[PDB]
Amino acid sequence: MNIIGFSKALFSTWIYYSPERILFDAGEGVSTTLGSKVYAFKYVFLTHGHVDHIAGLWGVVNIRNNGMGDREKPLDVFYPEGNRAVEEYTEFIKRANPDLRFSFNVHPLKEGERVFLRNAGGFKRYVQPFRTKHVSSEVSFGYHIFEVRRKLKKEFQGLDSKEISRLVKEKGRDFVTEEYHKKVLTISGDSLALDPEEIRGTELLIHECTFLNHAAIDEVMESVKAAGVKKVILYHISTRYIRQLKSVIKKYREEMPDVEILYMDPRKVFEM
Amino acid sequence: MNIIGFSKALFSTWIYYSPERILFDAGEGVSTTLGSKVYAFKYVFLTHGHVDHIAGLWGVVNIRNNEKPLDVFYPEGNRAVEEYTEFIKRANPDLRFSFNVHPLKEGERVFLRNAGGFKRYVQPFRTVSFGYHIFEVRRKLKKEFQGLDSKEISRLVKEKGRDFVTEEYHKKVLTISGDSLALDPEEIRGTELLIHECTFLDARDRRYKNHAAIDEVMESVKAAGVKKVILYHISTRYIRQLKSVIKKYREEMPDVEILYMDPRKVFEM
Numbered sequence A: 001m002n003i004i005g006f007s008k009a010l011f012s013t014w015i016y017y018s019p020e021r022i023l024f025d026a027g028e029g030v031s032t033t034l035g036s037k038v039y040a041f042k043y044v045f046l047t048h049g050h051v052d053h054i055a056g057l058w059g060v061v062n063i064r065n066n067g068m069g070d071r072e073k074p075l076d077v078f079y080p081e082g083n084r085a086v087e088e089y090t091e092f093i094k095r096a097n098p099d100l101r102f103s104f105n106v107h108p109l110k111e112g113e114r115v116f117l118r119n120a121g122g123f124k125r126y127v128q129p130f131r132t133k134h135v136s137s138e139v140s141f142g143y144h145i146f147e148v149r150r151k152l153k154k155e156f157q158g159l160d161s162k163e164i165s166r167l168v169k170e171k172g173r174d175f176v177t178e179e180y181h182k183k184v185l186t187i188s189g190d191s192l193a194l195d196p197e198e199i200r201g202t203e204l205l206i207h208e209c210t211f212l213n214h215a216a217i218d219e220v221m222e223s224v225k226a227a228g229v230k231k232v233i234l235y236h237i238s239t240r241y242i243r244q245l246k247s248v249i250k251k252y253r254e255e256m257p258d259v260e261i262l263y264m265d266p267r268k269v270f271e272m
Numbered sequence B: 001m002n003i004i005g006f007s008k009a010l011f012s013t014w015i016y017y018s019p020e021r022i023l024f025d026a027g028e029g030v031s032t033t034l035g036s037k038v039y040a041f042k043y044v045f046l047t048h049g050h051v052d053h054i055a056g057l058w059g060v061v062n063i064r065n066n067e068k069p070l071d072v073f074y075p076e077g078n079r080a081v082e083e084y085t086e087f088i089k090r091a092n093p094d095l096r097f098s099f100n101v102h103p104l105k106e107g108e109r110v111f112l113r114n115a116g117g118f119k120r121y122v123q124p125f126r127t128v129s130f131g132y133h134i135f136e137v138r139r140k141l142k143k144e145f146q147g148l149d150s151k152e153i154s155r156l157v158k159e160k161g162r163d164f165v166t167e168e169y170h171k172k173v174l175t176i177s178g179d180s181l182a183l184d185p186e187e188i189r190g191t192e193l194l195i196h197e198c199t200f201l202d203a204r205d206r207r208y209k210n211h212a213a214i215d216e217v218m219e220s221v222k223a224a225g226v227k228k229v230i231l232y233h234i235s236t237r238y239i240r241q242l243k244s245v246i247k248k249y250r251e252e253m254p255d256v257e258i259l260y261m262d263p264r265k266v267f268e269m
């Protein structure tokens, strides 16, 4: 599964994006739910430091440290620079359990700072944080996963199969293409409807939808519509608004046939 | 449900006992699973301070706070519980007065409010790790008065008092092992409900005697006169052998009700 996660507003939120071995947020229960799968984690990106987005980190590091043996690898954990709650909790984990001190590295990130990923299939993707409006208290980030790609220059897009192949054979691939950065994944974290520009072009939007501050579903769909996003996952949903949102979802699925709309049910583990 | 719990060895363990609004242990996920039921907690008793038994505590008080402080009891000397609760309060000023921790000495009783009856109390026993008994103080007619009729017994009670005609005895309503080896039959004997850890299904691969194997546990259940037992703290390795293994003992011991907490799902009873 490309994505396995769980999200219930105020209680716990965590999203495992398997393709890049990245865990976004770490609410309680992630290690219990994923088991030995936590050994496969290479990165943790935290949107912020509220307990429902970080309390599961201790279990992740504890299980990795006890179950990987001499083949354990340090877990890189990234969070919004200046977020004291993340720093206090990670310091407590290391202080309270010396055996875990070197099991993970905590890296504060500045907005816009890129982190290139190390996985199989090529060196071509990086994670990039953007500031979000949430508690107005501490710093929160949303994240994009970008993929460095190459596409044919406009002038060569009309050539047929044989013509483009002939040209590439003669002049090389780079000559007929230009590089561009595709947003392959966007996670909002807790925040108000993202600016249509922040989400435009993303192949998969994962946006909080706490209400029927945070964001209400209508403001989110409006944003998706303006940015022309085709695939969105709604999360950070509360249990009191289950059916109400569920109904508005089908309503939206009809009103927006070209857009795939999924949601993480606050009562069950999500998989895609 | 008198018991809603979840347990998976090394990952998370929490057992909510609704009759007394008591939560035993608080492994990660308890507030997420129980939701608003956490508002109902009257007490939390921790068997120890390993991450899989306490990481969910922050979540519980955070959700509760969002009304006297919740009382949290744990084994005296357990530094891990102290360090974690101190971190919660130091790092979250708003929760600083939301709960209180209380170290307990082995055998130290905590009488439960009740409706003012104080008929029930919790008592820890060593397994710093503690197991716990919930005791109910009951009364029964002294043997010498069993034959008196209604009028005769009331005349005696009037003249002598209720205490004179009855005798109080302490009944073990619930026993929770916490993490430990098979408990001495003496410790469990008499309990109406035993919830005992069952980390291994085969003692052969227990590099360290800090956990009980099912046969050993069943041995103690045998030696004592234990009615129903809920096996928990079960490891993932023995994920499927579970049924079988348990099916056999349900057979080799047809008088013993054997329930268990599947490491893959929340338990309800």
Ligand SMILES: [Zn+2]
Residues within 6 Å of the ligand: A009, A010, A013, A050, A052, A053, A190, A236
């Ligand atoms: Zn949140």
Ligand SMILES: [Zn+2]
Residues within 6 Å of the ligand: A048, A050, A053, A190
């Ligand atoms: Zn938040």
Ligand SMILES: [Zn+2]
Residues within 6 Å of the ligand: B009, B010, B013, B050, B052, B053, B179, B233
């Ligand atoms: Zn344990």
Ligand SMILES: [Zn+2]
Residues within 6 Å of the ligand: B048, B050, B179
């Ligand atoms: Zn333990």
